[PDB]
C-alpha cells in the first residue's frame, strides 16, 4: 500500500523489468549491426561475380574475334572437326558464364532475405524504445518518492540489485 517497504518493493519490480527490457534491446542492436555486416559481405561477393562475369565476357569477345576468320573459312573449306572445336569452346565458356550469372542470382535472392530480417529486427528494435523511456521515467519516480520518504540508501541499492 503506502508502506515504504511496499513502494520500494514496487521499485525493484520495475527496475528489473527495465534492465531486462534494456538487455533485450542491446541483444537486438548487436544482432542488427552483425547482420548488417554479413549483409555487406554479400554485397561485396555479388560485385565479385559481376567482376568475374565481366572478365569471362571479355575473354569470349577476343576469342570470338580470332575464331571469326578461321571459322568463316573452315565453314566453306569445309572442315567439320576443326570448326566444331571452335564452337565447342565458345559453348562451354558461355555455359560457364551462364552458370555463374545464375549462381549470383541465388545469392541476391538470399541477400534480400537477410535484408528483410534487418528491416524487421530494426522494427522490433523500435517497438521497445517507448517502453524503455517510460520504465526509466517510472523507476526514477519511485526513486524520488522513496528518497523524499524516510526511505534511504542501503535498501535502495538492495532494490536495484547492487553489490
Residue-range domain boundaries for the chain? 1-163
The grid coordinates listed for 23 are 538487455
Alpha carbon distance 68, 70 (integer Å): 6
* Neighbouring C-alpha atoms within 13 Å toward the C-beta of 113: 8
Question: How big is the chain by its Cα radius of gyration, in Å?
Answer: 33
The technique is X-ray
SS3 of the chain: the string is CCCHHHHHHHHHHHHHHHHHHHHHHHHHHHHHHHHHHHHHHHHHHHHHHHHHHHHHHHHHHHHHHHHHHHHHHHHHHCCHHHHHHHHHHHHHHHHHHHHHHHHHHHHHHHHHHHHHHHHHHHHHHHHHHHHHHHHHHHHHHHHHHHHHCCCCHHHHHHHCCCC
Resolution value, angstrom units? 3.3
What are the two backbone dihedrals, phi and then psi, of residue 162, each rounded to the nearest 5 degrees? -110, 135
Alpha carbon distance 44, 61 (integer Å): 26
Q: How many residues in the chain?
A: 163
Alpha carbon distance 114, 111 (integer Å): 5
- 1-163 in CATH: which number? 1.10.287.1490
Amino acid at each position: 500500500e503506502d508502506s515504504v517497504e511496499a513502494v520500494g518493493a514496487q521499485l525493484k519490480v520495475y527496475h528489473q523489468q527495465y534492465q531486462d527490457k534494456s538487455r533485450e534491446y542491446d541483444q537486438l542492436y548487436e544482432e542488427y549491426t552483425r547482420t548488417s555486416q554479413e549483409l555487406q559481405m554479400k554485397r561485396t561477393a555479388i560485385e565479385a561475380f559481376n567482376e568475374t562475369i565481366k572478365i569471362f565476357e571479355e575473354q569470349g569477345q577476343t576469342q570470338e574475334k580470332c575464331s571469326k576468320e578461321y571459322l568463316e573459312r573452315f565453314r566453306r573449306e569445309g572442315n567439320e572437326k576443326e570448326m566444331q572445336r571452335i564452337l565447342l569452346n565458345s559453348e562451354r565458356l558461355k555455359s560457364r558464364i551462364a552458370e555463374i550469372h545464375e549462381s549470383r542470382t541465388k545469392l541476391e535472392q538470399q541477400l534480400r532475405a537477410q535484408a528483410s530480417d534487418n528491416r524487421e529486427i530494426d522494427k522490433r528494435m523500435n517497438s521497445l524504445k517507448p517502453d524503455l523511456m517510460q520504465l526509466r521515467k517510472i523507476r526514477d519516480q519511485y526513486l524520488v518518492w522513496l528518497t523524499q520518504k524516510g526511505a534511504r540508501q542501503k535498501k535502495i541499492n538492495e532494490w536495484l540489485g547492487i553489490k
